[PDB]
Amino acid sequence: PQITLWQRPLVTIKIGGQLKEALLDTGADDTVLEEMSLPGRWKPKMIGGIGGFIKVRQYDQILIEICGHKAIGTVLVGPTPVNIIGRNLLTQIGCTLNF
Amino acid sequence: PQITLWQRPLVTIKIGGQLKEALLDTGADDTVLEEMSLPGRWKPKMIGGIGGFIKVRQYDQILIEICGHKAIGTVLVGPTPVNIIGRNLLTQIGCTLNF
Numbered sequence A, B: 001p002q003i004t005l006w007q008r009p010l011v012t013i014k015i016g017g018q019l020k021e022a023l024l025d026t027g028a029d030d031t032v033l034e035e036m037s038l039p040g041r042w043k044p045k046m047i048g049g050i051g052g053f054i055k056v057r058q059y060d061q062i063l064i065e066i067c068g069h070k071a072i073g074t075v076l077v078g079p080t081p082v083n084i085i086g087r088n089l090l091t092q093i094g095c096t097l098n099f
């Protein structure tokens, strides 16, 4: 589809059998979701954005479905204000910026 | 042009007769640039990101050229880690997300 930017580009994602709303964020290098439980081991990581850094848990090889498109990649979990779908996963669904 | 996301979507912008590099960020509601001098009066604004909030200076009706496209709008200036072109200007240049 073609998503305009008059409003925040929010989409429904499916992860771990749960439906959630997330932002397609081209400014985010990685994907970070609000606190939740995911299978497997995780490594601690610090990510920085506007306002500073937050500590998150890094999970690898996580399957996520974005608007019907299956994608696999690293997913970070932590105290993020909103669910963010970053470039590591946007590339997998063939998302591009056009103008 | 069509920009993929395997690397950060950085583009050259021109503001105040100077060339700078900025990120095309669909996750940013507004446009915020690193500390610099702009004409006119400014108003206070607080913007929240993944790590918290930062105070910025808001300048209105600022001329900014993005990857060749001229835009005139609100530009925020503050302690941002990188120059960010947000949705307010992305819409002016007709930028959309596609997949």
Ligand SMILES: O=C(N[C@H]1c2ccccc2C[C@H]1O)[C@@H](C[C@@H](O)[C@@H](OCc1ccccc1)C(=O)N[C@H]1c2ccccc2C[C@H]1O)OCc1ccccc1
Pocket (backbone or CB within 6 Å): A023, A025, A026, A027, A028, A029, A030, A031, A032, A047, A048, A049, A050, A081, A082, A084, A086, B023, B025, B026, B027, B028, B029, B030, B031, B032, B047, B048, B049, B050, B081, B082, B084, B086
């Ligand atoms: O903060 C955000 N948006 C806010 C904003 C920005 C400017 C002006 C106004 C407003 C209001 C609001 O929309 C966006 C910004 C995000 O696109 C990016 O910023 C560029 C950036 C790039 C590199 C280093 C630092 C910063 C980032 O933090 N990347 C980092 C990141 C994110 C997730 C995972 C990893 C990493 C590493 C960095 O790439 O975050 C999503 C969000 C939306 C709404 C509310 C809270 C949070």
